[PDB]
Each structure stands twice: as structure tokens, then as C-alpha cells.
Amino acid sequence: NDIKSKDATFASGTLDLSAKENSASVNLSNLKPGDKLTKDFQFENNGSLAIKEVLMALNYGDFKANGGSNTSPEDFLSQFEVTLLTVGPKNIILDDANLKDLYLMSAKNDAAAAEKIKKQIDPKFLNASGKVNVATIDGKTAPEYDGVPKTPTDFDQVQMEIQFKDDKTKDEKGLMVQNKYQGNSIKLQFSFEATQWNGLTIK
Numbered sequence: 001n002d003i004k005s006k007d008a009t010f011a012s013g014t015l016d017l018s019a020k021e022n023s024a025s026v027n028l029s030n031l032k033p034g035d036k037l038t039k040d041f042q043f044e045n046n047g048s049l050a051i052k053e054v055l056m057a058l059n060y061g062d063f064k065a066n067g068g069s070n071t072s073p074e075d076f077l078s079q080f081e082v083t084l085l086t087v088g089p090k091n092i093i094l095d096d097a098n099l100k101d102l103y104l105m106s107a108k109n110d111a112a113a114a115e116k117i118k119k120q121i122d123p124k125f126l127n128a129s130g131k132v133n134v135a136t137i138d139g140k141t142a143p144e145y146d147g148v149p150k151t152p153t154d155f156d157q158v159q160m161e162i163q164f165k166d167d168k169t170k171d172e173k174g175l176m177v178q179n180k181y182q183g184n185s186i187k188l189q190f191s192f193e194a195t196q197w198n199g200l201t202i203k
């Protein structure tokens with residue numbers, strides 16, 4: 001989470017499930033179609049709280065055109081897809097999910113957006129709220145197990161990949177259409193909310 005931390009970091013971020021703050025921010029700047037950004041996350045729970053889910057949501061902001069033709073924040077947002085998986089076999093939760101749809105679902109609980117994500121996602125990972133549960137134990141969500149041992153197991157490692165989708169479409173003038181986004185930038189924040197077994201955010 002630290003501002004001085006290298007943006008091209010190999011280490012998996014450690015998210016503390018006791019929840020001082022729990023976010024991950026990333027700037028989408030100076031990119032071109034086909035570029036990818038990867039990050040691993042590990043959930044730590046050194047007090048062993050009784051955590052049922054870890055609910056992820058997306059927010060965005062600070063769009064800037066920076067001289068590209070596109071001045072729409074959402075159109076730029078819509079050029080990126082996210083893949084989220086858990087390992088500990090790799091359990092795919094989200095596969096190339098459009099970030100604009102992921103935003104409207106997880107931020108707004110927009111039903112039409114949720115329908116687009118529901119094309120691909122296993123509903124086992126969907127919360128009521130429109131947020132995605134990313135906390136698994138061997139690829140199964142905690143509520144699939146028959147209670148919790150005295151000390152709860154560590155949740156599986158999370159791996160995320162954001163890609164700038166590469167259309168390759170040209171227009172009537174022979175120009176690459178996604179060149180409207182040239183120079184554009186935008187900021188994303190992925191939030192992670194641990195919940196109690198009653199579904200409430202941990203206090």
C-alpha cells in the first residue's frame with residue numbers, strides 16, 4: 001500500500017485481514033493495447049478472526065486524456081479486462097472480465113452489469129452486494145466446508161492480471177481505432193472487505 005513502493009514489484013502484497021486499511025491502487029498510464037499488469041496478494045490473519053468471505057470491489061478515477069482523442073473516462077476503462085485466480089490447481093474466479101462491467105457491478109450493484117459478469121463467473125463467488133468473494137481454501141469458498149477448525153486455515157494466494165485488450169481493428173482510413181486512447185490514463189483501486197459469518201463487515 002506504501003507510496004514509495006516500486007510499481008513494478010515482484011513481491012506479493014500482504015493484505016492484513018484485521019483491516020487497518022485494505023486496498024490496492026494501480027495507475028494505468030503509458031500503456032498500449034496488449035500490455036498486461038500482474039500482482040499477487042496474500043491474506044494474513046495473525047489474530048485468527050472468524051472470516052467467511054473477502055469481498056472485492058473496484059473504484060476508478062482521475063481519468064486524463066493527455067492529448068488522445070478519447071475524453072471519456074468509461075470508454076477508456078472499458079478497454080481493460082481483469083483475470084483473478086486463487087491457488088494457495090488454479091481456481092479461475094474472473095476470466096477476462098471487463099473493468100467497466102466489474103465497476104458497475106461491484107460499485108453500483110447494477111444488474112445489467114452483473115449479467116455480463118454472470119456470463120462467465122461461477123455464482124458461488126458472487127455476493128448479494130455485487131462484490132466478488134476472493135477468499136478460498138483449495139479453491140472452495142469457506143462456506144463449502146463443514147465448520148471451521150479451531151484455528152482457521154490461511155486463505156489461498158490471489159493472483160490478478162489486468163490487460164489492455166488488443167482489438168487490432170482498423171477504420172475506413174486504415175488507422176487503428178484504439179489509437180483514440182493513446183496517451184490516456186486512469187487510476188484504479190481494488191478494495192478487499194473481510195466479512196463475518198453473518199455477512200457483516202468485520203468490526
Ligand SMILES: O=C(O)c1ccccc1O
Pocket residue numbers: 007024025026037038039160161162190
Ligand atoms: O500493482 C499492480 O500492478 C496491480 C496489478 C493488478 C492488480 C492490482 C494491482 O495493484
